[PDB]
Amino acid sequence: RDHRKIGKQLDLYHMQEEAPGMVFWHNDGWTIFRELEVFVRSKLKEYQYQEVKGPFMMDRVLWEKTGHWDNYKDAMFTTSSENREYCIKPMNCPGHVQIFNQGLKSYRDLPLRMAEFGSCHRNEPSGSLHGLMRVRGFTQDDAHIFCTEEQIRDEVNGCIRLVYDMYSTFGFEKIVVKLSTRPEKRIGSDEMWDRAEADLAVALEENNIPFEYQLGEGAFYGPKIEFTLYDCLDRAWQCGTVQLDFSLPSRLSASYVGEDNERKVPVMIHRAILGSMERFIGILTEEFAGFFPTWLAPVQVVIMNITDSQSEYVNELTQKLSNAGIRVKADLRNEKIGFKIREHTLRRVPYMLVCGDKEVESGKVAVRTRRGKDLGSMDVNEVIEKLQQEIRSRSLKQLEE
Amino acid sequence: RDHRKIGKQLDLYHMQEEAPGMVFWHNDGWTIFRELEVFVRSKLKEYQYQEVKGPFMMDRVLWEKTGHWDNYKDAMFTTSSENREYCIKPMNCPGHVQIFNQGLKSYRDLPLRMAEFGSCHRNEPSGSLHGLMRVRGFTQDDAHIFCTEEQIRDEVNGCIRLVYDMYSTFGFEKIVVKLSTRPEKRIGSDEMWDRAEADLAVALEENNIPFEYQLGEGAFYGPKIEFTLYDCLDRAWQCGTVQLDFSLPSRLSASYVGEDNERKVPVMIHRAILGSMERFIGILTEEFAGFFPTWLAPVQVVIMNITDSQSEYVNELTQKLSNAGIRVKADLRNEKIGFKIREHTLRRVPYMLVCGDKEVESGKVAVRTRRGKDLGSMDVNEVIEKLQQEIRSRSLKQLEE
Ligand SMILES: C[C@@H]1C[C@H](C)C[C@H](C)[C@@H](O)CC(=O)O[C@H]([C@@H]2CCC[C@H]2C(=O)O)C/C=C/C=C(\C#N)[C@H](O)[C@@H](C)C1
Ligand SMILES: C[C@@H]1C[C@H](C)C[C@H](C)[C@@H](O)CC(=O)O[C@H]([C@@H]2CCC[C@H]2C(=O)O)C/C=C/C=C(\C#N)[C@H](O)[C@@H](C)C1
Ligand SMILES: [Zn+2]
Ligand SMILES: [Zn+2]
């Protein structure tokens, strides 16, 4: 269960010294990534998030305003144009605030949930870089919630439900949660922190989640909730976070018109479920030992011919399944059937369909799996039905599992 | 007819001086972008392209070997880590070759068509920066085809068909193709050039396209054809290109095992249809003067009510249309109905569904368009079917005509 070895065996990705900590996504790994993107977007539509795109770099003055220049300085890449210095974005938050600042905002626009798949580049020490898990470039599932003080609790709640939904989808039911509270010195009033902390704690309690306090471990800009999933090996992976920010909105001059027609500064919530999506792909790759659920599988079905006599037929089927929204390849190569079966078994292809003369005559397909289960001769439309159902339900288990 | 004014009016995007030439995509504009992306991906599936993702930056040595350091130096952003120089990629081609170089290749792996939506950063003089059309950051619809000299003609044919298909989708049927031939000094033998040029010419006239010749205007690394579409104002936009490259594979050491069991260097084809996708979004914004075909429209349907009495009903409908894959908003505020219709008409929302008491009792909707047409009372499911068809087909035209 090493995501790098499995990564090479399935031709998911590769890395080079000319770009340390930056992934080359091959077709299949990128298919996995894009499927993750699809799932996340379904969740964004369900939980009602906007999806935006921020610029890759912004000038140094912005990053000084946000405080990244004081705190994040070593971790940022800098480039320059026309005697102006720019940092490549380590985070998507300031850009999101810049978007929020366009147009007048009122209380009616709140809560405003703004999501992006962030392309972030942090310059990490090269000695710390490991696989997909510790990288210089990465893509965050990143959202920011602009709300009022009264809307905090509910929004945190929605974030919690989102976390558990999304995690249970991949089969992680074991989640340890940590609430980090105020340090000795902080931005924001004692009252603001009391409200925020009470909101987090109470939300977690109402969702029936046992959690542990980490005292003084909260950032100076706000209290937070962190989510650690456990894999099938009982290894701990910290992914999800809900973080309050009392710093960013005032520094970037975010404001809205309240009910009283008075200028208010919105509360900000950083929320991420998977965190780094590259890293999450590493984690999934190791959890699944290379066998991905059908919806996550780069190639879902491979259709093979015994001889050239089946070729036409195979092609025919390959179109049909392709038009059904299934990811399917045909192996027409001149090879023995066992060669193909072996090759596609090592590739962890969920479904191998075999066409001999029997299938050409009958209008059926011989169905077998990567687990060595023979499902036997099946009607094509039946196969398409079951595959489509398995894909739409994002099931962890195959037919007859 | 200014994509900047229309962009501001429709809340599509904005730009700042902290990121010159770099777009902040708001929710709506990003929705347009995502629809473009989806369409292109449909064409990638149809024309059988891989989709990959390359790294954002790479070592300066790489860009020296590609020839960018000599030719592209002023256009590239440079950043550094641990006493090593990296360039942010102006182009996606070297990364694609790097991916290609992973694993042994044979002729049986060819043609290999590799696509990406490239995030490319070139450093353009700030004074030449205009809107979405001239930008520092951009996303290219980019592909590279690795093939044998024998497959060149077929691949160019495929690219041509792709170009005309995609352009036809957006309503540009007026296209001028220009074939740029060999410069006095060039990379590659006169034979390679005779064959490539003849392949471009013959593919073009196989497609019945009266191409114009540009003599000696080709690059030193290969011959090309370029595609210029004309809009409704009959102004020319050069977008697509098919560009042969003899320089890149040799410089980057790409090779495959021939059918003769000998070492072969793959022929490389750079191909793009839209070119910059931001720029193409601008061009489309001006072409449609803000009225995006329903498939491209950020908000496809706005369901509105007369009084509170219809609110519930409206909500139902909204959810329904949201469940049918339609992008739909509910306008519940207390305002004149005409107020709402005018506001959403100026927002270029394709369809406005008006619900009064009669619609509630009859289970229907009163259908209106941004063009000012009254489509009358309609069955809800009928509207859903027609909208779904209009979207699936990517029709340039709305209902009732
Ligand atoms: C410039 C400051 C850097 C900060 C002190 C770095 C710490 C190590 C830590 O606080 C980072 C953090 O938890 O950010 C977390 C993010 C969320 C997902 C994972 C983590 C992530 O992206 O790593 C969210 C907070 C962002 C905070 C800001 C912004 N923007 C603040 O306004 C600003 C004061 C941050
Ligand atoms: C480093 C060299 C720069 C070249 C001299 C710049 C010229 C102005 C022009 O030839 C660029 C060009 O046509 O690139 C075109 C692209 C395609 C879409 C529009 C254009 C685009 O991206 O702008 C593709 C060519 C890429 C070529 C290489 C690469 N990699 C070559 O191996 C290498 C020798 C190019
Ligand atoms: Zn953030
Ligand atoms: Zn290229």
Residue numbers in the entry:
A (entry chain B), B (entry chain A): 242 to 642
Report text from the authors:
ThrRS is one of the 20 (in general) aminoacyl-tRNA synthetases (AARSs) that are essential enzymes responsible for charging corresponding amino acids to their cognate tRNAs and providing the correct substrates for high-fidelity protein synthesis. We determined the crystal structures of both human and E. coli ThrRS in complex with BN, and identified a unique structural inhibition mechanism of BN against ThrRS. BN occupies a significant fraction of the total volume of the ThrRS enzymatic pocket, physically excluding all three of the physiological substrates of ThrRS, namely L-threonine (L-Thr), ATP and tRNA. Although occupying the canonical active site cavity, BN also extends into a fourth ‘orthogonal’ pocket.
We also crystallized an E. coli ThrRS fragment containing the catalytic and anticodon-binding domains with BN. Consistent with the 48% sequence identity between human and E. coli ThrRS’s in the catalytic domain, BN is bound in the active site cavity with a nearly identical structure in human and E. coli ThrRS–BN complex structures. The r.m.s.d. of all 35 non-hydrogen atoms of the bound BNs from the two structures is only 0.314 Å. We investigated whether BN induces such a state by comparing the E. coli ThrRS–BN structures with those of canonical ligands: L-Thr26, ATP35 and AMP together with tRNA27. By comparison with all three standard aminoacylation substrates, L-Thr, ATP, and AMP+tRNAThr, BN is inserted 4 Å deeper into the active site cleft. The additional interactions associated with the deeper binding lead to a significant conformational opening at the upper side of active site, thus highlighting an induced-fit component to the binding mechanism of BN. This upper active site opening also distinguishes the ThrRS–BN complex from the comparatively modest conformational change observed when ThrRS is bound to its aminoacylation substrates. In our structures, a major feature of the BN-induced conformational change is a 14° rotation of the α helix comprised by residues 431–448 that produce a 10-Å displacement of the preceding loop. This structural change is observed in both the human and E. coli ThrRS–BN complexes. In support of the discriminative role of these residues, mutations at H309 and L489 in E. coli ThrRS (corresponding to H388 and L567 in human) confer 300- to 1,000-fold increases in Ki, representing significant resistance to BN20.
